[PDB]
Amino acid sequence: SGLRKMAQPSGLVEPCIVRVSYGNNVLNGLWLGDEVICPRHVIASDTTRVINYENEMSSVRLHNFSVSKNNVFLGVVSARYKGVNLVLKVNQVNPNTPEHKFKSIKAGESFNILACYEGCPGSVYGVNMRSQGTIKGSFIAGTCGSVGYVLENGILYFVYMHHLELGNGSHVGSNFEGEMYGGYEDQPSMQLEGTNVMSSDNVVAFLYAALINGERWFVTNTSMSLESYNTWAKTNSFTELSSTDAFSMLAAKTGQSVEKLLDSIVRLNKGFGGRTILSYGSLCDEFTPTEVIRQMYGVN
Amino acid sequence: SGLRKMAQPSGLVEPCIVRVSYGNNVLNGLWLGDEVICPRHVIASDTTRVINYENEMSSVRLHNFSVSKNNVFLGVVSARYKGVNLVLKVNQVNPNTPEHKFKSIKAGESFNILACYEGCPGSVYGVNMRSQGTIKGSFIAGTCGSVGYVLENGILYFVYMHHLELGNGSHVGSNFEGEMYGGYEDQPSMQLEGTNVMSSDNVVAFLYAALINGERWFVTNTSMSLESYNTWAKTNSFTELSSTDAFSMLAAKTGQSVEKLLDSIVRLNKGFGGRTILSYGSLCDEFTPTEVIRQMYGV
């Protein structure tokens, strides 16, 4: 069973998705307790040109918001910005609010996206946060407000809320404190993403998955120390490898030390030639050590 | 923008998942009404040797089954085989049984898998049915009994239950009528998969997505008519293309009419020459035209 991207189940999250419209703008929000959070650009008069958010808020009329789960309509009793998110106090507590926390995702970490269309959950898939604070997902007009979440040992953390797409196609969102990942502005502007730095952690994990799957052609039987690799990485847009401790059970299971995979990376970064790994034509950094271990052995 | 294999939400299915054990075997079952369905091989006293299902059925002792949700067990009142599925009547109705239907998936069609580990929902991902009736999923020991479903216009359909993995890594399961997709036997035998036939309409969809996503290297100053492509298709493990009717909007926004993409397929089959398309080193037939259209400019 090769390496494919998965999402954790979505059932705890689905009951919290609501439809939010204001003016001609429609998107999704997240309903926990007596509050609904959604991108603040929903109250903007024209999201196509620069927005003066202070003015849009001063002119705001609460009864112009339409917030709904299905046939359930939520009166908005107040609205305030919390960074790039709008927080709407509403007249009903969501009876299906799951127990949860909030946290921010770091470069190289994976999480789940529940893509929603006008208030209706549509799909779910796994993503991985890139160094510049963007993700390579799949969002179309109307998916703003979609929610990113991760479950860790029974704890549900909400971690992302979708805002916009960069000119280069990458996707940008915020955490629930309202800080935009990557620092990008919620405006129609020419901001650039910048150069992305590959996660060595995840690429080493990708190669272990390939070994476990029966592909070993990139195996060198020559090992590169963690220090030599790290100096090489600072100069080739890859992150410094923490320690080799995260791969202990993977190295034991395949018989390949991390240092041999490090040597494989330096060589494979030159180019796969006419060969592939897990059907990819180049190194993949989308899978974390923990994703691979669960997917390959399932002990989580 | 962007193309990813996605799955439809699992909230309706998760409450139906249960742990079913018997002997040294532990796998998953689907709990609907007062019945639990699971792969009948959970009854095998020895899974390393050919299984005689009549004998395992004759000597069954209902008390040896253990069926539970969370740490809560259910009583097994009876057990019968329905094709390769084991059906167990239990002493209790699932109060969370969603409204549902059952249907069979055809070659080239996509559906969702809710991968489960010994009674517990662990992950959700989309798959697509191969010509020989198998899927390329990610199932590891303990995920047998995982469930395949599809949502269409608000109607939930259960379509697959996972049984086993063939020597070549391909995955085999049955429908809810108890028929194994592809007619494979539910035995620990070394049966082969058979020649895999690539779905053409899905490959064109994929190439269209690559165009929309910005890759053009594979597009050339050429066109291969519907009729001639369908001819090459027949002797090169590829299906026939009914019409170009499905691609109107894709062909319209990319500016590449279908017959040009058909030409690309014929020429990529021999290798990408080291290049990639949406990151893959070979052609992908895992996405249907509808799946791609909905993700490209939105429905």
UniProtKB/Swiss-Prot annotation, chain A:
Species this protein is from: Porcine transmissible gastroenteritis coronavirus (strain Purdue) (TGEV)
Record's protein name: 3C-like proteinase
Function: Responsible for the majority of cleavages as it cleaves the C-terminus of replicase polyprotein at 11 sites. Recognizes substrates containing the core sequence [ILMVF]-Q-|-[SAGC]. Inhibited by the substrate-analog Cbz-Val-Asn-Ser-Thr-Leu-Gln-CMK.
Domain Peptidase C30: 1-300
Lineage, opening ranks: Viruses, Riboviria, Orthornavirae, Pisuviricota, Pisoniviricetes
Active-site residues annotated for this sequence: H41, C144
